[PDB]
């Protein structure tokens, strides 16, 4: 699937897996499971990177004028804003994304909607609607307003291709932002905004230090 | 009632708006009970809230303009000129607790299977009439009047007039739930209702706080 998909994404280059990562048999789950996991990982990273790019650009200039967000400046690094955020807010955000992730991982639910797990014939990135949830669920994650629920089939794959490419571009973009943030001059022509000095992969560095470190 | 009955009711309340449930409470099965009973509970809730809100609108106008009873000591004890939300907070808590328990006795009377089936109706969730209130015929002790029409008026009303009146009840309730909350929101949040700026006296307390002293932590006794 990866060869044909790569040619669809960029037919000139065709296929470039220089490290043969598809060939490597991840967790001994089979090459098909490697392909499924890798495609789902690329899509997950692309979605989160696209959102993180837009969110970084927004947070560098605007904050919500109600508390606790009104107290944060916008003239600092967005990573610094996250660092200042209260410990409870950090844990709650991470727990909410954990809910979305474990709901995506729940086999019974996406099986209800007619999908399998991403590494066994599951089309990568089919998030489920919150119908199996217990109490009222007014909206969903994908197509929350049900605007384009009746989309076109060929459009439903052209959009996947565009999503993959835009996700790749956003991966490199958000990481360029983080690079210039924690290392000034890391991305030339980007050294204009924010130079916080701390690890962005430390969700609770401001709160606590894990023992042993 | 069925969802078809709700659609008909909505199209009779407002032909243009029609059935306008965008959150699907009419479809969510409440407590696992059938749609015909969730519709009953939701419709009874709409009627009841509209009732209480219409009464609350008139009462808020009465309290803000200090039209008080002339021959009671509690009203005299409450200071004059207060905001209508504060005219509730300045009362002895024992009177609040008796207003609330009066509503409790009345809403225990209403939902009673025996009284309803003696008078002929059933519960609003059991296919009965939503927004009905049984009279005090099976009461332990005699009492002079019922709640709905303590006097005789509408004892000889046509079913057409009753249907028109129930439609007007639902519509006026929908409007009064918004008018009374406009009063409360302008009182506790100035410049929230744009048209009442400088009309509704301001207020600082919580209108969703019935008793001054917290009953769950430290009540007061008399």
């Amino acid at each position: 699937a990866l060869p044909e998909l790569s040619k669809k994404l960029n037919p000139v280059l065709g296929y470039w897996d220089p490290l043969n990562l598809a060939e490597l048999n991840f967790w001994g789950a089979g090459d098909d499971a490697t392909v499924g996991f890798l495609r789902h990982a690329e899509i997950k990273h692309g979605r989160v990177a696209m959102a993180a790019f837009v969110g970084y650009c927004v947070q560098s200039n605007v904050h919500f004028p109600w508390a606790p967000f009104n107290s944060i400046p916008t003239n600092i690094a967005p990573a610094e804003q996250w660092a200042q955020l209260p410990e409870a807010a950090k844990w709650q955000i991470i727990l909410f994304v954990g809910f979305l992730e474990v709901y995506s991982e729940h086999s019974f639910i996406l099986e209800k909607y007619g999908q399998k797990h991403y590494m066994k014939g599951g089309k990568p990135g089919f998030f489920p609607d919150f119908d199996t949830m217990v109490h009222p669920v007014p909206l969903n994650l994908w197509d929350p307003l049900k605007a384009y629920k009746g989309a076109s089939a060929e459009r439903k794959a052209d959009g996947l291709l565009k999503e993959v490419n835009n996700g790749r571009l956003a991966m490199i973009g958000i990481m360029g932002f983080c690079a210039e943030a924690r290392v000034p001059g890391a991305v030339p022509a980007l050294s204009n905004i924010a130079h916080y000095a701390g690890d962005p992969m430390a969700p609770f560095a401001a709160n606590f230090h894990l023992p042993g470190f | 009632e069925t969802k078809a009955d709700l659609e008909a009711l909505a199209k009779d309340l407002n032909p243009a708006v029609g059935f306008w449930d965008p959150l699907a409470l009419s479809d969510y099965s409440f407590w696992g009970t059938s749609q015909e009973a969730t519709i009953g509970f939701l419709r009874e809730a709409e009627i009841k809230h509209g009732r209480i809100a219409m009464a609350g609108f008139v009462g808020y106008i009465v309290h803000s303009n200090d039209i008080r009873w002339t021959f009671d000591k509690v009203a005299a004890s409450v200071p004059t000129g207060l905001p209508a939300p504060a005219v509730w907070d300045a009362i002895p808590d024992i009177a609040k607790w008796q207003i609330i328990l009066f509503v409790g006795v009345m809403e225990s009377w209403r939902e009673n299977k025996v009284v309803l089936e003696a008078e002929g109706q059933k519960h609003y969730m059991s296919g009965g009439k939503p927004g009905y209130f049984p009279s005090f015929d099976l009461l332990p002790h005699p009492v002079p009047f019922p709640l709905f029409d303590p006097f005789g008026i509408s004892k000889r009303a046509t079913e057409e007039k009753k249907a028109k009146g129930r439609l007007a009840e639902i519509n006026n309730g929908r409007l009064a739930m918004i008018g009374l909350f406009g009063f409360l929101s302008e009182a506790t949040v100035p410049g929230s209702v744009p048209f009442l700026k400088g009309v509704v006296p301001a207020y600082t307390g919580e209108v969703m706080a019935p008793f001054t002293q917290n009953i769950f932590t430290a009540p007061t006794a008399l």
Binding site: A147, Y148 | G18, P194, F195, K197
Partner: protein, 211 residues
């Protein structure tokens, strides 16, 4: 209206220009409706923008000339020599809300398919006449003077005259948006529109689209 009819209508609007659609918005499915629906929505949007822009051109002139009624207190009390935007911004907040809420009710009435179907029309996306504002027959209380043509000067007009009038509506509104936005631009960034520079478009120092 189908896209062939859209090309035809563009030709009637201007034989020379034709179907100038550089963004191809007509060939689309907004919110997943049909192409005919997208055409209906775009047509209603164009007609409504032209209508509001035509009224806004007249209103901007009328305000810039400080022409105010001889019976009102609010306008007569409001300061004179102001720009139209300053005049709107110093209008009372309640007055602004009544204006916007009546416009809201008119939009609701226009969109309401029950009323259009009672009058033998449909919603514009679902196949119908774009820009038709229904009468007020269905109102709870029987008002006089329906919105379009309250006194009834076009009741006996012919279909051909009406089609010509709709084409004129679209084109005149097309330049009306340009004119009103020229006034707003000249009150904002000076020298945006050269020609008005002599008349002295009353400068305004706020973002109009932020009530």
């Amino acid at each position: 209206m189908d896209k062939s009819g859209l090309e035809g209508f563009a030709k009637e609007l201007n034989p020379v220009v034709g179907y100038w659609d550089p963004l191809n918005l007509s060939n689309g499915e907004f919110w997943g409706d049909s192409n005919s629906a997208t055409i209906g929505f775009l047509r209603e949007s164009e007609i409504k923008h032209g209508r509001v822009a035509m009224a806004g051109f007249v209103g901007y002139i009328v305000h810039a000339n400080d022409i105010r009624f001889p019976w009102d207190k609010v306008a007569m009390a409001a300061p004179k020599g102001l720009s139209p935007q300053e005049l709107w911004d110093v209008t009372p907040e309640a007055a602004k809300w009544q204006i916007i809420l009546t416009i809201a009710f008119l939009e609701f009435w226009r969109e309401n398919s029950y009323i259009l179907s009672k009058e033998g029309e449909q919603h514009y996306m679902r196949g119908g006449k774009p820009g038709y504002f229904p009468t007020f027959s269905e109102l709870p209380h029987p008002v006089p003077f329906n919105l379009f043509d309250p006194f009834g000067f076009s009741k006996n007009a012919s279909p051909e005259k009406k089609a010509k009038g709709l084409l004129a509506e679209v084109n005149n509104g097309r330049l009306a948006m340009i004119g009103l936005m020229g006034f707003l631009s000249e009150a904002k960034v000076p020298g945006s529109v050269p020609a008005l520079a002599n008349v002295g478009i009353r400068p305004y120092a706020g973002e109009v689209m932020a009530p």
